[PDB]
Design an enzyme around this catalytic site. Structure first.
Site, short mmCIF file in Angstrom:
data_model
loop_
_atom_site.label_atom_id
_atom_site.label_comp_id
_atom_site.label_asym_id
_atom_site.label_seq_id
_atom_site.Cartn_x
_atom_site.Cartn_y
_atom_site.Cartn_z
N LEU B 31 96.03 -28.12 11.07
CA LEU B 31 96.82 -28.40 9.57
C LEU B 31 96.78 -26.74 9.12
CD1 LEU B 31 94.18 -31.17 7.70
CD2 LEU B 31 95.78 -31.37 8.75
N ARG B 33 95.79 -22.65 10.44
CA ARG B 33 94.36 -21.21 11.30
C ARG B 33 93.49 -20.99 9.71
NH1 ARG B 33 92.73 -16.84 11.54
NH2 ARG B 33 94.54 -15.68 10.60
N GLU B 38 90.70 -22.57 13.84
CA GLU B 38 90.81 -24.31 13.37
C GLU B 38 90.99 -24.65 12.18
OE1 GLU B 38 95.10 -24.09 16.75
OE2 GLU B 38 93.09 -24.86 17.08
N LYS B 54 87.49 -27.36 9.41
CA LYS B 54 86.76 -26.62 9.25
C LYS B 54 86.77 -25.50 10.47
CE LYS B 54 86.77 -21.47 7.71
NZ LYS B 54 86.80 -20.86 6.49
N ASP B 152 86.35 -13.94 -5.23
CA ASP B 152 87.81 -15.08 -4.49
C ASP B 152 87.94 -16.67 -5.49
OD1 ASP B 152 89.55 -14.21 -2.69
OD2 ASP B 152 88.85 -15.83 -1.43
N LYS B 154 91.46 -18.84 -4.48
CA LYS B 154 93.49 -18.60 -4.58
C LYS B 154 93.45 -20.02 -4.21
CE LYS B 154 92.38 -17.84 0.48
NZ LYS B 154 92.98 -16.61 1.92
N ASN B 157 93.00 -22.35 -2.10
CA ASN B 157 91.72 -23.05 -1.50
C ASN B 157 91.09 -23.48 -3.33
OD1 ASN B 157 91.36 -20.67 0.13
ND2 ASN B 157 89.72 -19.55 -0.58
#
Ligand code: SGV
Ligand code: RET
Lengths: 324, 346
Positions: B31, B33, B38, B54, B152, B154, B157
């Site tokens: 889905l 890397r 991966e 993950k 963080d 983004k 995410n």
């Protein structure tokens, strides 16, 4: 019989013209013609010229993209290697020999060339089988959930090798023999006569069953399942246009894939079976070159089908060709 | 396609689904890397339900010496669970990679979802963006209440589920501070989603997470980063200069409320950066942007966006949209590495 028996040669043309000798010592022109050799040499040259770039690319693209080295890619690398064995063991030798019009590396040469050619072709054969298996397990989901890891992949690669050795190694210890096939400029396994003292009869049965029929069944099983699964999937997802395209596409691809296995090994099996059932039917050795042409060309069409027609590989290759 | 066949197999499993052991999960196409290894789809032996896994590859771990980072991500995600932060379902290892198997969010991620609405639609419509922003804010607030600085955030995410309720994900670049330090210095997060303070290696509080929120929202609506144009990312030094100096321009796609909100978050002065000024995460919520939002209804999951992804069609990047990273260059595992892998496993 329908050939000429020897101690290390079996000309599949009967001696009755009084000129059939050892094809390691006599130039063939009494069952072949110079033009046929030019065409033979041309055909083998072509197969080297195409086969080597195609297989080189398959290995190459994986080396420059880390992420492509995955459990499912081991077998693809293996396929490319297998094909290259056929190129340097088989094709190059046959190209050299053809211009003399007979096999000039002698009985020992015949055993060597025949070993590398058989090894190559069998690793290739079984590669196609394993690849289909992996696809069957992943997509058709035949048994309850299991992970597929690198270690399993490596075992798979080794297994194809073992099966190939199981075919290529027996004629070296006197359980059958390597003897010229085709226009007598390539060496295959003897299968044109039953001959208990050299164990030819038992071997021919073994070859036909274990190395054609078994594979043939597996190929049909796996891909049959795959088409079934994908049709079912499409039925459960008719709210997605993509899946409808996919079912048609999968059917097309599967036909190409099945045909590619058939073309390569069906000629050998067919001819061998016919001679076995009707022992005493003599045909020219040019008839016996027909299976070799089809088989050798799989070094080109197998990697085209199984590598080039994958979206991911295409993109990566295009990137690399366009300076990246 | 063959990539379509792999996608088709995923679809096949999904269709059936709609209608441990480390060798106990059926593997489909990747889905993406991820950060390390991966991140592929996978399926439960016992329930036939789809999860993303993950994987953090052992090889890639050795290369970056990313052993500390792995252990951090484990402990944080393992402890932190809410209704706006994803749960972790399993942490096991194989002999080749460490696995995190996490909970369903089958609606794809916001970064994908920008392009899945239509690729020629730049971001989302304002109401739709407002809904997602509200849900993200609740997730940030929950972290801050446990004294966690994320460093963080983004679009990729922020994951959507099938009902269009979003959750933040990945807490591997986060640090949980104790009650005694309210600030810490360090360099953490993905560049171009990091606040001035982080880049300069200075002390910072919860403010930096709100800087990241600004970057996220700006991209959510306009489909491009504030500090570089879409499908770009300049070198770290230049990117750092952009974050520190560049006054972000605001399109007329925005309403006045959204313009003003973006300006407040993309401020390079933390003292003037709305988010935790006066120690309130509820001060941020008072901004006119959140006019459509009622906190009680938000918390009860009674707010939905206009575009809600299909609950029978999977969404996420395929196996040719992937990335790649250095697996070992002839470098065989040391005893130390093996001991970390064993230690990691619970
Ligand atoms: N870590 C997760 O939970 C997930 C990561 N991805 C994809 O995998 C990519 C690499 O992390 C992301 O950008 C997403 O496209 C996911 N896609 C779908 N569902 C998920 N639960 C995840
Ligand atoms: C003999 C034989 C078989 C295999 C033949 C092979 C593998 C030939 C390879 C020739 C090459 C590679 C020439 C170049 C089959 C298909 C099992 C069927 C039974 C008869």
């Amino acid at each position: 019989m329908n050939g000429t028996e020897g101690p290390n040669f079996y000309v599949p043309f009967s001696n009755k013209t009084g000129v059939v000798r050892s094809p390691f010592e006599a130039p063939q022109y009494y069952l072949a013609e110079p033009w046929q050799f030019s065409m033979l040499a041309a055909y083998m040259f072509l197969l080297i010229m195409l086969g080597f770039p195609i297989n080189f690319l398959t290995l190459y693209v994986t080396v420059q993209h880390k992420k492509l080295r995955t459990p499912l890619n081991y077998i693809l690398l293996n396929l490319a290697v297998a094909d290259l064995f056929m190129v340097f063991g088989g094709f190059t030798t046959t190209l050299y020999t053809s211009l003399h019009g007979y096999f000039v590396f002698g009985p020992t040469g015949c055993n060597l060339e025949g070993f590398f050619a058989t090894l190559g072709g069998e690793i290739a054969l079984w590669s196609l089988v394993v690849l289909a298996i992996e696809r069957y397990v992943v997509v058709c989901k035949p048994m309850s959930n299991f992970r597929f890891g690198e270690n399993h992949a490596i075992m798979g690669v080794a297994f194809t090798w073992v099966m190939a050795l199981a075919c290529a190694a027996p004629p070296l210890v006197g359980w059958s023999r390597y003897i010229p096939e085709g226009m007598q400029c390539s060496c295959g396994i003897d299968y044109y006569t039953p001959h208990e003292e050299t164990n030819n009869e038992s071997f021919v049965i073994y070859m036909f069953v274990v190395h054609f029929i078994i594979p043939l069944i597996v190929i049909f099983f796996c891909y049959g399942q795959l088409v079934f699964t994908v049709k079912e999937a499409a039925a459960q997802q008719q709210e997605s246009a993509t899946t409808q395209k996919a079912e048609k596409e999968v059917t097309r691809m599967v036909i190409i894939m099945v045909i590619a296995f058939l073309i390569c090994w069906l000629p050998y099996a067919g001819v061998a079976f016919y001679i076995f059932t009707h022992q005493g039917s003599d045909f020219g050795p040019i008839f016996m070159t027909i299976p070799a042409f089809f088989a050798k060309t799989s070094a080109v069409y197998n990697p085209v089908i199984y590598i080039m027609m994958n979206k991911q590989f295409r993109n990566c290759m295009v990137t690399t060709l366009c300076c990246g | 396609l063959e990539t379509v066949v792999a996608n088709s197999a995923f679809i096949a499993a999904r269709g059936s689904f709609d209608a441990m052991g480390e060798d106990w999960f059926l593997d489909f196409r990747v889905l993406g890397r991820g950060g390390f290894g991966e991140v592929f789809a996978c399926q439960m032996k016992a329930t036939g339900k789809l999860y993303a896994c993950k994987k953090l590859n052992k090889k890639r771990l050795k290369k970056r010496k990313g052993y500390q980072g792995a252990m951090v991500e484990k402990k944080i995600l393992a402890k932190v669970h809410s209704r706006f932060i994803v749960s972790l379902a399993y942490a096991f290892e194989t002999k080749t990679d460490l696995c995190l198997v996490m909970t369903i969010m089958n609606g794809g991620d916001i970064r994908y979802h920008i392009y899945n609405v239509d690729e020629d639609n730049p971001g989302f419509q304002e109401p739709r963006a407002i809904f997602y922003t509200a849900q993200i804010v609740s997730g940030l607030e929950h972290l801050h209440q446990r004294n966690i600085i994320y460093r963080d955030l983004k679009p990729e995410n922020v994951l959507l589920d099938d009902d269009g309720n979003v959750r933040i994900s990945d807490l591997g670049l986060a640090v949980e501070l104790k009650a005694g330090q309210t600030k810490t210095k360090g360099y953490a997060g993905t560049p171009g989603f990091m606040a001035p303070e982080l880049l300069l290696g200075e002390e910072y509080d919860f403010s930096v997470d709100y800087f990241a929120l600004g970057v996220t929202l700006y991209e959510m609506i306009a489909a491009r980063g504030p500090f570089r144009a879409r499908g770009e990312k300049v070198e770290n030094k230049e990117l750092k200069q952009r974050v520190l100096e560049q006054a972000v321009t605001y399109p007329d796609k925005f309403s006045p409320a959204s313009k003003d909100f973006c300006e407040a978050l993309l401020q390079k002065d933390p003292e003037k950066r709305l988010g935790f000024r006066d120690g309130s995460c509820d001060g941020l919520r008072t901004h006119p942007l959140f006019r459509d939002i009622s906190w009680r209804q938000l918390e009860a999951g009674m707010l939905t966006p206009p575009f809600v992804p299909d609950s029978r069609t999977v969404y996420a990047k395929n196996i040719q949209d992937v990335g790649a990273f250095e697996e070992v260059k002839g470098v065989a595992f040391e005893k130390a590495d093996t001991e970390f892998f064993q230690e990691f496993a619970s």
